[PDB]
Amino acid sequence: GPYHPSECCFTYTTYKIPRQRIMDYYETNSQCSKPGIVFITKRGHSVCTNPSDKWVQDYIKDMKEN
Amino acid sequence: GPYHPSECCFTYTTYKIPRQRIMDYYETNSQCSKPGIVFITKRGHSVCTNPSDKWVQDYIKDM
């Protein structure tokens, strides 16, 4: 329904996430105070990253299909 | 971990949630841009509410 909360990022990791841990990603709601790409990991955890970091962009490109 | 996202509220409910639906609640991270109380319903819906609403505080009190 339309009143659910949205996940927002407040602190980003500075460290590239080992690609073997990565299950998926999503972009955080633009209403959040900061931009965010959240990576979902094998153990079901969520890790905030900065979309403007080159490695985050590189990861997303290798994860996406055309 | 230290880099987990937090749930934040942007669109508050437009109705008083029937009490019977509610299983639990949590207050959102105070770092969110708006104050929020999220009620968790039986059916796994999370519903954002304004902690300044009397009915919300009344619910929390009773729970």
XYZ file of C-alpha atoms in Angstrom:
129
model
C 0.000 0.000 0.000
C 1.071 3.605 -0.465
C 2.046 4.508 3.139
C 4.906 2.080 3.557
C 8.275 3.609 4.556
C 11.238 3.715 2.169
C 14.814 2.586 2.878
C 17.245 5.515 3.001
C 21.038 5.623 3.244
C 22.795 7.834 5.820
C 26.326 6.425 5.745
C 27.927 4.718 2.747
C 30.630 2.083 2.755
C 33.897 3.351 1.294
C 34.911 -0.271 0.543
C 34.050 -2.126 -2.655
C 31.839 -5.113 -1.812
C 33.388 -8.454 -2.937
C 31.257 -9.337 -5.974
C 30.762 -12.913 -4.691
C 28.631 -11.563 -1.837
C 26.235 -9.635 -4.106
C 22.722 -10.916 -4.833
C 21.004 -7.774 -6.217
C 20.814 -4.017 -5.857
C 18.249 -1.291 -5.787
C 18.182 2.505 -5.923
C 16.789 4.303 -2.881
C 13.741 6.602 -3.082
C 14.633 10.051 -4.431
C 12.812 11.494 -1.394
C 15.712 10.313 0.809
C 18.083 13.098 1.882
C 20.952 11.384 0.012
C 21.195 9.311 -3.178
C 21.757 5.607 -2.534
C 22.402 2.299 -4.186
C 21.725 -0.556 -1.739
C 23.404 -3.891 -2.475
C 21.622 -6.967 -1.156
C 24.068 -9.658 0.053
C 24.080 -13.443 0.333
C 23.284 -13.417 4.005
C 20.245 -11.204 3.302
C 21.931 -7.949 4.425
C 21.685 -4.509 2.786
C 24.714 -2.279 2.265
C 24.482 1.404 1.407
C 26.742 2.770 -1.337
C 27.213 6.062 -3.127
C 25.852 5.972 -6.716
C 28.585 8.477 -7.715
C 31.413 6.031 -6.852
C 32.829 4.537 -10.059
C 32.863 0.957 -8.695
C 29.147 1.152 -7.861
C 28.377 2.207 -11.466
C 30.681 -0.564 -12.816
C 28.919 -3.180 -10.642
C 25.449 -2.068 -11.757
C 26.523 -2.279 -15.433
C 27.761 -5.889 -15.010
C 24.549 -6.814 -13.122
C 22.033 -5.336 -15.601
C 20.738 -7.001 -18.791
C 19.692 -5.267 -21.994
C 26.176 -3.833 9.350
C 27.268 -0.205 9.968
C 26.148 0.653 6.423
C 22.569 -0.666 6.555
C 19.746 1.641 5.296
C 16.934 2.764 7.632
C 13.216 2.832 6.959
C 11.919 6.440 6.686
C 8.378 7.782 6.273
C 7.368 10.183 3.505
C 3.649 9.604 2.922
C 1.648 9.318 6.142
C -1.616 7.403 6.308
C -4.808 9.239 5.396
C -6.949 7.087 7.744
C -6.872 6.006 11.388
C -5.700 2.371 11.158
C -8.284 -0.010 12.668
C -6.583 -1.221 15.854
C -7.440 -4.876 15.106
C -4.984 -4.900 12.135
C -1.975 -3.850 14.157
C 0.617 -6.399 15.330
C 3.520 -4.141 16.383
C 5.125 -0.732 15.735
C 8.511 0.941 15.549
C 9.731 4.512 15.566
C 11.815 5.352 12.532
C 15.468 6.415 12.781
C 15.613 9.981 14.157
C 17.949 10.752 11.229
C 14.972 10.476 8.834
C 13.829 13.865 7.486
C 10.361 13.387 9.073
C 9.269 11.831 12.390
C 7.488 8.510 11.867
C 5.758 5.722 13.703
C 5.408 2.609 11.512
C 2.603 0.251 12.454
C 3.061 -3.324 11.286
C -0.179 -5.067 10.334
C -1.218 -8.737 10.434
C -0.870 -9.000 6.676
C 2.739 -7.680 6.663
C 1.972 -4.140 5.563
C 3.936 -1.334 7.206
C 1.965 1.913 7.529
C 3.646 5.261 8.236
C 1.950 7.530 10.792
C 2.620 10.984 12.282
C 3.703 10.647 15.975
C 2.023 14.048 16.586
C -1.426 12.476 15.987
C -3.272 11.719 19.239
C -4.634 8.350 18.039
C -1.065 7.177 17.271
C 0.118 8.038 20.764
C -3.010 6.441 22.221
C -2.285 3.222 20.275
C 1.342 3.152 21.419
C 0.229 3.712 25.043
C -2.187 0.746 24.893
C 0.343 -1.542 23.202
